[PDB]
Write a protein that binds this ligand. Structure first.
Ligand SMILES: O=C1NC(=O)[C@@H](c2ccccc2)O1
Ligand code: NA
Ligand SMILES: [Zn+2]
Length: 257
């Protein structure tokens, strides 16, 4: 099955998932000089005050912090979006070294990691129905650079020892995702896809311009996770990112001048 190695990585995904070569695949390079300011875009409304985190899971591809999405609690509205999108989970993609790890790039720059907060459009009732729709999902992407520590990330870092291998989970209640945001909510947006199989073309991407800083020690802990299950040969969970894909007939819009 699919992964990030030589024999099962991004260059192989199209065999099982032919949409890998589709018309609106993600991630992409954001060419900042050609992303046009769109004065009709609205400020992003991030309403996370009532978020209920539940659990953290190593799924063999990343670690997901999962939320109660059975009701309108943590929601994303505004920006390029019509209606209301509920937060279901967040996770990261990261590198083996600080010079790579992000999925999106900015003028070809790769960041050390990228946070994805995944939301689904409540007009479709459940996540599974939302991923059958071209406007089913909204993913808020946030770049990570290595510098000062991010205090709001440390609770995540400190639980990782308990979910080292694929299939392990741990209770993870009362985590506030507001502590992972940068100051500014200025963003770029474009229509795209999931960046892993099944690569479904359901996503309004909202990529924040301002990275967050995390410390070297924080990202080093991400890199001690394992892709493998317990009692299998150890494969460090690093370089779990898909490279940039062809932009094709799309335009990236900026929310800011
Ligand atoms: O942007 C994405 N990051 C991923 O891991 C992938 C994704 C796969 C499955 C569910 C939600 C998101 O899409
Ligand atoms: Na453009
Ligand atoms: Zn992701």
């Amino acid at each position: 099955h699919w992964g990030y190695g030589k024999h099962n990585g991004p260059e192989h995904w199209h065999k099982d998932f032919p949409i890998a070569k589709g018309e609106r695949q993600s991630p992409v390079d954001i060419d900042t000089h050609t992303a046009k300011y769109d004065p009709s875009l609205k400020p992003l409304s991030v309403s996370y005050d009532q978020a209920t985190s539940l659990r953290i899971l190593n799924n063999g591809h990343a670690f997901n912090v999962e939320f109660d999405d059975s009701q309108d609690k943590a929601v994303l509205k505004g920006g390029p979006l019509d209606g209301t999108y509920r937060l279901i989970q967040f996770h990261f993609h990261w590198g083996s070294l600080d010079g790579q790890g992000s999925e999106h790039t900015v003028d070809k720059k790769k960041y050390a990691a990228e946070l994805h907060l995944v939301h689904w459009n409540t007009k479709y009732g459940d996540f599974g129905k939302a991923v059958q729709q071209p406007d089913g999902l909204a993913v808020l992407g946030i770049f990570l650079k290595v510098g000062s520590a991010k205090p709001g990330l440390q609770k995540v870092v400190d639980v990782l020892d308990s979910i080292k291998t694929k299939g392990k989970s741990a209770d993870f209640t009362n985590f506030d995702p507001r502590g992972l945001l940068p100051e500014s909510l200025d963003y770029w947006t474009y229509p795209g896809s999931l960046t892993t199989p099944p690569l479904l073309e359901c996503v309004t991407w909202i990529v924040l311009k301002e990275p967050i800083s995390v410390s070297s020690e924080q990202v080093l802990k991400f890199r001690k996770l394992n892709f493998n299950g317990e009692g299998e040969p150890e494969e460090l969970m690093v370089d779990n990112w898909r490279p940039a894909q062809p932009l094709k007939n799309r335009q990236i819009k900026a929310s800011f001048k």
